[PDB]
Nucleic acid binder design. Sequence first.
DNA 1: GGATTACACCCAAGACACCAGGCACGAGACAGAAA
Length: 56
Amino acid sequence: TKDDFSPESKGFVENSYLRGLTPQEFFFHAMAGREGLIDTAVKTAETGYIQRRLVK
DNA sequence: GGATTACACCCAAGACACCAGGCACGAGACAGAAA
């Protein structure tokens, strides 16, 4: 429902991996994992440029 | 306005002066013409 600030409504996975994730928790956890992948794949180039400038 | 934005490796696939038009050499066929 609209205007719901409960923990389960904004991405709190109550279960464990052994117990299994409900579809909403699955989607939120997928969003977080996608953010992690993007952050890695983006910061690697910036770090490479910084190290090249330092070495030069 | 200018300059620069990680490293290495693999494979596959599609494009890369085309052309047209005016000038030359050789040849040959079907029609001329004397007999």
